[PDB]
Design a protein around this ligand. Structure first.
Ligand SMILES: Nc1nc2c(ncn2[C@@H]2O[C@H](COP(=O)(O)O)[C@@H](O)[C@H]2O)c(=O)[nH]1
Ligand SMILES: Nc1nc2c(ncn2[C@@H]2O[C@H](COP(=O)(O)O)[C@@H](O)[C@H]2O)c(=O)[nH]1
Lengths: 796, 795
């Protein structure tokens, strides 16, 4: 035993399990770089491999593209835990493989994607981004699974002596930002695929979570928050939002956001959430809007600096109906028919006012105030909210004033924002002495304390109510995790709520800590009791800052019995690749991997049974097995011999007579049947006809290992495996290259994968397979919940 | 911290443990030579798609020098990635020879396959190509050697009858590889020094059985030296007639798989006693084909000997063989008969392997009379005669030195009688006592039987203290535990080694490395229940339960005595063209605790010019890359970190920061603005203004590698000092061997670093190791290397 190979007894201990968890933080080493100049590709490929050992591939066109993709990415799928950079240069034209297809492939393998096939050989962009490969390897400054990034990691700082060649790195926070972004993008993809009308692209966020305002507007979605109780902001007015009171954050380390013109994005993404029609006064330039998707929005912009080119550019970039007007806004006409407001009749309207003067400012504002006080009251228009900049040294009385707030990304600015609303205060006297004293307290707070005051404006798009009783009709979109997962929320009452949402054809995306993965991480000693405790399903969390909170853990089998399928964040962004406008990430996160995300069973069966590369588990089914085989001296053919030996032991334990089968143990045949026999199973008996070949599913086995360390696509894969029990046709509306990893019959159809017996047999040896691979340091709980979920998928 | 690069949260003691573990996998390379490029491309695809093996093809579309340079710079960074690497060479033998590609492969600890003149459908070619896909990430060709004869049988990995398992004794197998490589290095020395064949002898200090086989695989004859010999307890003068036994420890069943091991065990011993052999009954003796016996003469008697057999035996072994197709005449009794005239006034030994089914015990008596006669010649110096012994009745025997059992004979009841002149004059061997002696022998385990070869090998063993031996003539000696153990003090050992380097002898010395062993204990890899240490006094223990004392040595102590550390990897690659030993499959933590050393005089004579066989290329980058990946160190950031360390050091020595501008790139560490000096043990380091300084990166990387495995640092330092100026390429050697060195326009090898750029790197070396290993480095290891480099750059 100790002196034999393959060897699991000396090589796989609790320490090796720890190291595998650690290696999982590095499971995204891929960069996909598209350019149109092959000699330039060969030069930097050799440069980055000679200097840092980056594995490089070039898809040059000397081989057909489908074959080129299949060979390259079947190789790469096994190296993803090798802790070394991988770079695929793509030099074929866009007519051979399109930008959107290559982006789907790259993101399905957790890679960064760079598209530069239109640039000539000596572009500044092209040479610079190619030289970055050599400078940064094994790192790269293009995010994985997303073109954009705005966190504190600044890659140029790694090359500067002034910074000591260092930069910030908040893997957990950044991956949490990437997750909120992807969940939003998946809802965006769901809205397009279900042809949901534009003015109904609304998503309910259960529990307040500020970044969803920006992510939703980046995708043309309006967010609504749902909260159990209403925290009294402590200010004046009917909702307490006139000079609200503050309570401070805890000592930490600071996470800084580097969005350009962040102060304008914060107010404008919020206002755009309130109405599909916007009156924007002072809009020039509004370059910050160019990065949003505003399909269905109508913006009536007023600024003397508006040109005809500005209106055309803004509409082209955002997709919104923009109507630029190069006149100063006339605040002293009190008519609807003036200022072109006629278009907004019998519809809702919100107003954003960014106008300011250097002459007669303080009474210029009361002209605007008197006009906005008049404007909020029309019955031919449903004016929802008016944003105005406020700075007064003289006391004023204001009507319909709902809120008077500081600016979260305002720093030392003495300027405030006033919000007008129908349900606001009938009258209130704003004494300029207390706003000055208020702005002195605000400007003396830490930037972190200032940014958290955005909860005051965001509560103007918040609803009070129990999320477990909301209306689910209309395919309503809901994203829900902590605030739903546990507020002492009964696990029964949550599971029933999710069960009803699936039956109502609703889109409630749900996330929760994975009970059995967390347990396994604690047992092997990766997560310590001082950081995370657990008693059955109840979890007590803590982050390194000192905050603690309770949460309920769920498992894949509990949610499948409630009509919910686990899908990974990787699969979600790849599936949504042609709609995603979010951020990417640079590092994976152990803490984020403890959580699993789920989607309703009805939407899986409707849209997801035909697995192309976007929903492939290829980035998980090969790299864990390959890593273990390298540590444990498991030759390639020896691995397949082991699968036969485990089948032989299993069949003997079910009192099958060995004379009825012949163990082969190959890559194509597990065993041959001699006499017909049957094996008891909960999904009905497994029937093996005599003189047949049986080849059990390796995807199931290797995903069982993978489910110990990261979120598993096991249940989504199982549903696609059942679908692929017979030959299928390739969908005609999808690009053929998305199927390079789907094997094809001689007639050009999609070949069947496995029979039902071949799948469920793998489920039965699955426990002993993990016990073998992990030296009995596996988790029977994780195997059992998966096993129990495979059985429900194949239920008879 | 919340910053990258990050060493504080990524490198703790557990991370150090893993690096030590990963070192067991530091030989993932296979170099496969074949002439068919589309076949290489087909299997390069099959092995990478199925197992993730990284594949390279040297296909001749690019000039060979830069193809090697590009491919092996890439590979050198990946040797610790725990993934197999395969390089296919499809260019012709005239573009890069077999012996040059073998040196390259072994210099990178790879296995080597040469099949370049085989058809695209050759049985062996397609078989060994399919073995790549079937065995990956393993391969069945040994690393750093063509042959393997241990218990690991790769075919069992594919057999369901075996449960797809096989034996795996990494520590013993690597110790066998080490013995073999040391022997080969002594053989390469014998070639370079033009040592006459009849004087190719090596003295193994301390009895060490496998050296008999490794020496005869290289045309060398072994001699053991023991301080004292326990008398075997038997009869005759030297007590070798039926010696008594004391048996071994319960445990590991390591069974060597040599074909006809019974004959190799005797024949390699008999071949150690004389260059001229009389082989009676020599057919077929296929076991001899594996040996290198150039300078031997074998006269072989067997009625089945053909002239083809005499040809294939001489072509394989290189020996001069006379093939007599006739029965030996044991009654002739003449020095001028049986063609024996050719041995007059020569040394001779006799291997007798004859038998008969009828007339046997009479046939033995006829043989015995001829041998008792033949041992007494004055015309020829008959040194030893071995005969099959199986007698049913008492006999008187003359000149009988030994009557031994067959160590690999298992249950066979026949024995071996050895005739020598210094043997018993008359002695009666009662057949009733041998019968019961063979009763006890055949009842022992196979390991107890095999160990009786000590009785044979004490006939090529001298008694005496090894520190008093004569070192004249460039004598070759292999010495390890039986020198460095606590019965002799270090001072008396170091003086012996110092007097041997002064005397221009080739004493190859090995010892455990004090600081590497202490570092493996401090971080928690080696526990006190296995190895304990009191300063430099080490108490070992292996899983069988045996315990022993030994003394640790350091690189500085031995450079003080005129000895240079050289790794096993460098020895086998330096000796590649003569090497005929075994390879290995896995590296061993236990063996990595040891260091081997050669005399400084020979380093200076033959090893200052660094071609790929002597380079540290397979160690100067794989640790740095592994750490850069763990700790998020970008490529250019790694070079700015280097300049920042020089900044912190120069300011610590009260250099004014205005005198230099830190650049921190791969080409320039910093630029000098004003002339300044920094004090140093070897004389001040002089930096003049308007100069670019680029310190030695290899020294920094090697200091890291010296924490985990043996270091070529001191050999590298001697080659570095020799490279302060340009040096002319040797016109002897193939120029592909220098693919990794920069060659000047003129055709000579370009200077590497000035004296200032080396010693500056050695001074920031401690802080570099503190940075890379999160202050969990070994100051002892840094200091012993720093003091050895200082001694190398002495003025
Ligand atoms: N594209 C794709 N093919 C699969 C998947 N699962 C199985 N297959 C196909 O079915 C074959 C047999 O499945 P396996 O034995 O690997 O579970 C695979 O080699 C592959 O061709 C999958 O999840 N995605
Ligand atoms: N071939 C070879 N070149 C070396 C070695 N050490 C330094 N160099 C040369 O020295 C220069 C870089 O110095 P380093 O920073 O690598 O010590 C390069 O020109 C490199 O080729 C060595 O051990 N072998």
């Amino acid at each position: 035993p100790d002196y034999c190979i393959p060897n699991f007894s000396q090589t796989v201990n609790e320490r090796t399990i720890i190291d595998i968890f650690t290696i999982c933080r590095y499971r995204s080493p891929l960069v996909v770089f598209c350019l149109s100049h092959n000699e330039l590709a060969k030069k930097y490929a050799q440069d980055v491999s000679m200097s840092s050992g980056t594995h490089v591939h070039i898809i040059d066109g000397s081989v057909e593209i489908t074959v080129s993709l299949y060979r390259t990415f079947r190789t790469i799928a096994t190296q993803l835990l090798g802790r070394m950079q991988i770079v695929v240069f793509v030099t074929v034209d866009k007519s051979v493989v399109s930008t959107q297809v290559m982006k789907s492939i790259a993101w399905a393998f957790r890679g960064s994607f760079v598209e530069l096939r239109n640039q000539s050989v000596d572009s500044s962009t092209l040479v610079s981004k190619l030289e970055n490969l050599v400078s940064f390897a094994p790192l790269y400054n293009v995010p994985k699974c997303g073109p954009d990034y705005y966190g504190p990691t600044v890659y140029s700082e790694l090359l500067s002596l002034a910074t000591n060649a260092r930069t910030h790195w908040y893997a957990t926070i950044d991956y949490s930002m990437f997750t909120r972004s992807v969940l939003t993008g998946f809802v965006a993809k769901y809205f397009n695929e279900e042809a949901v009308p534009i003015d109904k692209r609304i998503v309910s966020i259960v529990g307040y979570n500020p970044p969803y305002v920006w992510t939703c507007l980046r995708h043309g979605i309006r967010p609504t928050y749902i909260e159990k109780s209403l925290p009294n902001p402590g200010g004046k007015g009917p909702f307490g939002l006139i000079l609200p009171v503050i309570n401070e954050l805890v000592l930490k380390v600071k996470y800084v956001m580097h969005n350009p013109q962040i102060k304008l994005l914060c107010l404008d993404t919020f206002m755009l959430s309130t109405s599909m029609n916007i009156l924007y006064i002072g809009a020039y330039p509004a370059t910050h809007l160019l990065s949003l998707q505003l399909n269905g929005w109508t913006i009536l912009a007023f600024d003397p600096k508006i040109t005809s080119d500005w209106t055309d550019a803004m509409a082209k970039a955002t997709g919104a109906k923009v109507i630029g007007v190069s006149k100063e806004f006339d605040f002293k006409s009190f008519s609807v028919q003036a200022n072109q407001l006629n278009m907004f009749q019998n519809s809702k309207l919100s107003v954003i006012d960014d106008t300011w003067v250097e002459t007669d400012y303080e009474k210029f504002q009361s002209e605007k105030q008197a006009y906005f006080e008049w404007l909020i009251d029309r019955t031919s228009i449903d004016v929802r909210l008016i944003s105005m900049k406020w700075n007064r040294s003289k006391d004023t009385s204001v009507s319909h004033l709902l809120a008077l707030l500081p600016q979260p990304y305002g720093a030392s600015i003495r300027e405030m924002r006033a919000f007008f609303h129908k349900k606001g205060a009938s009258d209130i006297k704003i004494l300029a002495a207390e706003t000055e004293k208020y702005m002195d307290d605000f400007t003396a707070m830490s930037v972190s304390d200032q940014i958290n005051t955005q909860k005051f404006m965001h509560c103007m798009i918040t609803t009070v109510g129990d999320a477990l009783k909301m209306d689910l009709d209309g395919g309503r979109a809901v994203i829900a995790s902590y605030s739903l997962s546990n507020s002492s929320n009964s696990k029964e009452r949550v599971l029933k709520f999710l069960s009803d949402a699936n039956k109502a054809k609703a889109m409630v995306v749900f996330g929760a800590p994975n009970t059995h993965r967390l347990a396994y991480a604690k047992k092997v000693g990766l997560v310590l009791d001082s950081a995370i405790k657990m008693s059955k399903d109840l979890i007590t969390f803590s982050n390194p800052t000192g905050r603690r909170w309770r949460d309920y853990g769920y498992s894949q089998s509990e949610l499948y019995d409630a009509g919910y399928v686990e899908i990974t964040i990787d699969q979600m962004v790849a599936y949504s690749s042609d709609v995603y406008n979010g951020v990417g990430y640079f590092a994976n996160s152990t803490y984020n991997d403890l959580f699993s995300w789920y989607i309703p069973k009805w939407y899986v069966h409707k849209r997801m049974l035909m697995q192309d590369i976007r929903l492939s588990p290829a980035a998980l089914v090969k790299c864990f097995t390959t890593l273990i085989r390298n540590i444990c001296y498991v030759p390639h053919e020896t691995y397949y011999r082991f699968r036969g030996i485990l089948v032989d032991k299993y069949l003997r334990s079910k009192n099958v007579d060995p004379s009825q089968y012949s163990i082969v143990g190959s890559g194509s045949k597990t065993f041959t049947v001699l006499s017909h026999f049957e094996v008891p199973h909960e999904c009905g008996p497994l029937v093996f006809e005599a003189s047949t070949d049986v080849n059990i599913s390796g995807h199931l086995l290797s995903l069982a290992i993978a489910a110990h360390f990261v979120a598993s696509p096991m249940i989504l894969w199982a549903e696609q495996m059942k679908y692929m029990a017979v030959d299928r046709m390739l969908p005609p509306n999808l690009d053929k290259s998305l199927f390079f990893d789907n094997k094809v019959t001689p007639s050009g159809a999609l070949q069947r994968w496995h029979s039902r017996e071949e799948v469920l047999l793998a489920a039965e040896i699955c426990e002993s397979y993990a016990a073998m691979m992990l030296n009995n340091k596996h988790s029977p709980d994780i195997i059992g919940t998966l096993k129990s979920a495979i059985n429900l998928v194949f239920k008879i």
